[PDB]
């Protein structure tokens, strides 16, 4: 040809790193050779040749992906079948992984006659091969052809797909199982009943737990292809067995895909079969399962039968739960604590109060933060269910104790809820034993916490009015500008920085603007490099009048402080306000 003695030197190439840059661009070479030349000696070369390193092969098989056209089109695509059937048999999976990817791809680019002609034959070649690899690499080629061949070919494929599900090598059986999924979708009921199912069963009960496992995965999709009528007769016996399975890994499968199955099965089979099962999962020996179960709690209940719901939950689920709250595994606890608050708009005020608060409360006190954390996050809700007053005579307490929780997150958590909380409780109530709480945070060991606490005020004001700010907050804040610890005085200038945003002109100017300007003479330069930044912040709020009267004046003197930082900022202010 032309590069048939040029690419060869490019290949035999002393180094390997360039044979990548060669095959990677093995499409501008097919462009070169005509569609009669690409398949003339270009494909017959890449066949009985190329033995390079696995990565080169990866390159080749990938490239042989986009090619259906660079050799003709749906008329000739079946000229790519022999160079793959070779790659799809190498031992390193990463490679044959791709190859089968390409195979599957260009399969569509075939013609009904093309398939029963060359493809399907290769599918029997791989599947019959000596090397388990090949048969494995085969498994992923049935789902594609079958849909478009003869009722005689189908008769073979299926038959073939069966010997695989029983292969001597688990590798392959796992393969077939990991493929029982889709291949069942392209079959037509009659089959799926008298074939998939049997395979699905055998596989769900195969010696290797690593396969029954892969079987169960298939369950949902299968069950999603049979009207309710049959499921009780086909899927259930198996699915039933699953939940009990010797291998936790399998029970886990069932557990984890539990909701999905619900919606797959039906609403009645759910209480007839699943619900009992769910109970044993939650009671399961292996935590990794109990946990995987606990997550499913809420959604499971929600999607129960519109009617029996309240019943089953209270009679079946609810008791297990109450046992889970005391679980040993920091996880199961944790998992559950996340979804448990979800059983209220589902159960009921009273019920919740009698049956759930103790639970929540048990959790609000857990020694684990991921838990304490998980419970705090859904409170905003339950308050909808049980009365607001009920909330204060049961949880309010825990919540307060929570606000002095050891862990900053937990604290943080309480803080972000507080605004919403107060709101609900009423200003007058807050004023009592909540205010004090919100102010302490302004001094938390951890910055993130203090910062949040500060915002909290702003939020709190927005919810309660500047009047409120004025006689309840502003004070304690300015008073805090007295504390000997220089850090705290800063916190003070910060609150001012925040409150000013929502207290309006007339209040900033007569209760804060002052204290701000005063601290501008703090023995600690830091307080002062910040006092500038502040006068800058609460600048636009003020009026051109008050500004040039007290701001600019006792702001200028600042550009004449020692510490450069002070200066750095002091004037930066004047650079925005126009001074």
């Amino acid at each position: 040809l032309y590069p048939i003695a040029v690419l060869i030197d490019e290949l035999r190439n002393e180094d390997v790193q360039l044979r990548l840059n060669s095959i990677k661009k093995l499409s501008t070479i097919a462009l070169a050779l005509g569609v009669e030349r690409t398949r003339s000696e270009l494909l017959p070369f890449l066949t009985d040749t190329i033995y390079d390193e696995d990565e080169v092969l990866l390159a080749l098989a990938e490239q042989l992906g986009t090619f259906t056209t660079l050799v003709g089109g749906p008329e000739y695509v079946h000229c790519l079948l022999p160079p793959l059937e070779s790659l799809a048999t190498v031992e390193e999976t990463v490679v044959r992984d791709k190859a089968v990817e390409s195979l599957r791809a260009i399969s569509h680019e075939h013609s009904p006659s093309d398939l029963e002609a060359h493809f399907v034959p290769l599918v029997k070649r791989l599947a019959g091969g000596d090397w388990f690899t090949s048969r494995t690499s085969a498994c992923g080629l049935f789902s594609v052809c079958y849909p478009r061949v003869s009722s005689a070919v189908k008769a073979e494929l299926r038959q073939y797909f069966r010997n695989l599900c029983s292969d001597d090598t688990p590798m392959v059986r796992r393969a077939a199982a990991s493929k029982l999924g889709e291949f069942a979708k392209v079959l037509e009921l009659d089959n799926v009943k008298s074939e998939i199912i049997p395979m699905f069963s055998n596989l769900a009960s195969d010696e290797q737990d690593s396969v029954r496992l892969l079987a169960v995965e298939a369950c949902v999709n299968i069950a999603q292809l049979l009207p309710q009528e049959d499921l009780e007769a086909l899927v259930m016996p198996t699915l039933r067995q699953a939940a009990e399975d010797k291998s936790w890994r399998v029970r886990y499968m069932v557990a984890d895909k539990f909701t999905e199955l619900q919606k797959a099965v039906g609403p009645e089979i759910t209480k007839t079969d699943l619900v009992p099962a769910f109970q044993n999962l939650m009671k399961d020996c292996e935590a990794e399962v109990r946990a995987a179960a606990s997550h499913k709690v809420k959604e499971f209940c929600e999607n129960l039968s519109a009617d029996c719901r309240e019943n089953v939950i209270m009679s079946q689920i609810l008791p297990c739960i109450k046992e889970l709250v005391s679980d040993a595994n920091q996880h199961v606890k944790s998992a559950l604590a996340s979804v448990i608050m979800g059983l209220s708009p589902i159960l009921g005020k009273d019920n919740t109060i009698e049956h759930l608060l103790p639970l929540f409360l048990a959790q609000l006190k857990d020694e684990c933060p991921e838990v304490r954390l998980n419970i705090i996050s859904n409170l905003d809700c339950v308050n909808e269910v049980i009365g607001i007053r009920q909330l204060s005579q049961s949880l309010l307490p825990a919540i307060v104790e929570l606000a002095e929780d050891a862990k900053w997150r937990v604290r943080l958590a309480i803080i972000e809820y507080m605004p919403l909380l107060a709101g609900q409780l009423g200003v007058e109530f807050f004023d009592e034993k909540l205010n004090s709480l919100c102010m302490a945070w302004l001094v938390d060991h951890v910055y993130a916490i203090r910062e949040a606490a500060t915002s909290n005020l702003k939020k709190l004001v927005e919810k309660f009015g500047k009047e409120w700010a004025h006689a309840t907050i502003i004070p304690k804040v300015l008073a805090m500008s007295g504390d000997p610890n220089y850090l705290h005085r800063m916190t003070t200038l910060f609150c001012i920085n925040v409150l000013s945003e929502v207290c309006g002109q007339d209040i900033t100017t007569k209760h804060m603007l002052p204290t701000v300007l005063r601290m501008a003479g703090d023995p600690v330069a830091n307080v002062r490099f910040n006092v500038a930044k502040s006068l800058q912040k609460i600048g636009p709020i003020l009026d051109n009048s008050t500004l040039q009267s007290e701001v600019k004046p006792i702001l200028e003197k600042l550009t004449q402080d020692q510490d450069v930082d002070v200066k750095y900022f002091a004037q930066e202010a004047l650079t925005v306000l126009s001074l």
Partner: protein, 80 residues
Amino acid sequence: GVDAMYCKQWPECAKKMSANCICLLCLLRMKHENRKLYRKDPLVWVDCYCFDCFRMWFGLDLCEGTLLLWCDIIGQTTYR
């Protein structure tokens, strides 16, 4: 438990990290490699007792869980 006989230093040996080791895991792999020169066919848990052939036969991931199992089997086998 896990003798420095079956496997010395976990994470490593399992992936040729420990040098000139003398644990079965390490050694058995060598048999595997060696044994795979004269032969072209892919080795399989029956014919090989190497940690990897094992894993693949039961499709288990690389973790101490799987290391323990492999040992129980190499044990039952070394003892009649």
